[PDB]
Amino acid sequence: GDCCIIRVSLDVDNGNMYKSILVTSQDKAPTVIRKAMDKHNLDEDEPEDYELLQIISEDHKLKIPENANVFYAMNSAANYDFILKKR
Amino acid sequence: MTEYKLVVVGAGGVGKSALTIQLIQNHFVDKYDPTIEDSYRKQVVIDGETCLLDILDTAGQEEYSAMRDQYMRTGEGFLCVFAINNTKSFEDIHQYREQIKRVKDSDDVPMVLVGNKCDLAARTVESRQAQDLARSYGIPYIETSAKTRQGVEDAFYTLVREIRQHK
Numbered sequence A: 001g002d003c004c005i006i007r008v009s010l011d012v013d014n015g016n017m018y019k020s021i022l023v024t025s026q027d028k029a030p031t032v033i034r035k036a037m038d039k040h041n042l043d044e045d046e047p048e049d050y051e052l053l054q055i056i057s058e059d060h061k062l063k064i065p066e067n068a069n070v071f072y073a074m075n076s077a078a079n080y081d082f083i084l085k086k087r
Numbered sequence B: 001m002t003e004y005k006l007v008v009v010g011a012g013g014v015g016k017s018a019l020t021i022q023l024i025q026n027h028f029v030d031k032y033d034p035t036i037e038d039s040y041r042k043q044v045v046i047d048g049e050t051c052l053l054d055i056l057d058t059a060g061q062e063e064y065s066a067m068r069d070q071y072m073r074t075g076e077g078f079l080c081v082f083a084i085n086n087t088k089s090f091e092d093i094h095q096y097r098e099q100i101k102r103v104k105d106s107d108d109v110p111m112v113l114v115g116n117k118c119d120l121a122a123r124t125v126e127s128r129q130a131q132d133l134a135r136s137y138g139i140p141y142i143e144t145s146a147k148t149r150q151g152v153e154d155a156f157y158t159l160v161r162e163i164r165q166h167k
């Protein structure tokens, strides 16, 4: 039942810095993207047009493959800061 | 432009997120969505002076209680929220207060007791017992409604002024 708390930010400017969600070891990219979208109230939109990037730093960003297991794909030794944006 | 780090605390479902979102994004949508930890920021004018408001919207669920120590240490002011139709949340608010004082180790932490959901007729917590509790705590008591936006600005701005008075 492994999982981690990650911070997801939106590429917009609406007053929110980030919103935390849970990433279980069963979570594939489509699952986390829909979870992030809902959390940020993007229920109308489709997870297809969305991309998930891990912010390692201001110069480094890890692109999470569309069908990858986020729990195992993300850099666990880095910041659990992610950005949800349109592909 | 001075920055203020506000923290919204209280039992689950009392309206912490609703309150925060009402202030920051000026809207209310009835939705079930338990918080782990969300962060907001908005520049706003309070008493003829622009300042930066950092708002940490915390989890009411006991599942994420281990995070309390960390945010209580960094937080400068706390909005202690409870719902007027939830007696248990009113009782829980005592625990938050004592925990904040314990972690920060101070007898004068900027706080504001908030009685949310004052729009609901089914009141189970009288304003009198809440005011007396706030009086004993020596902090202000403000009844709010994240739905109608009643007292929302007052609650957050009063906490800001409280922090300013302390700092």
Ligand SMILES: Nc1nc2c(ncn2[C@@H]2O[C@H](COP(=O)(O)OP(=O)(O)NP(=O)(O)O)[C@@H](O)[C@H]2O)c(=O)[nH]1
Binding pocket: B010, B011, B012, B013, B014, B015, B016, B017, B018, B019, B029, B030, B031, B032, B033, B034, B035, B036, B058, B059, B060, B061, B116, B117, B118, B119, B120, B144, B145, B146, B147, B148
């Ligand atoms: N009538 C009414 N409903 C409210 C008010 N504030 C919040 N609610 C409703 O109460 C429910 C829970 O509110 P929410 O803001 O999610 O509570 P929370 O304290 O943030 N929950 P959590 O601790 O799990 O993060 C939601 O359906 C919300 O719309 C209010 O002032 N009036």
Ligand SMILES: [Mg+2]
Binding pocket: B017, B018, B033, B034, B035
């Ligand atoms: Mg919530």
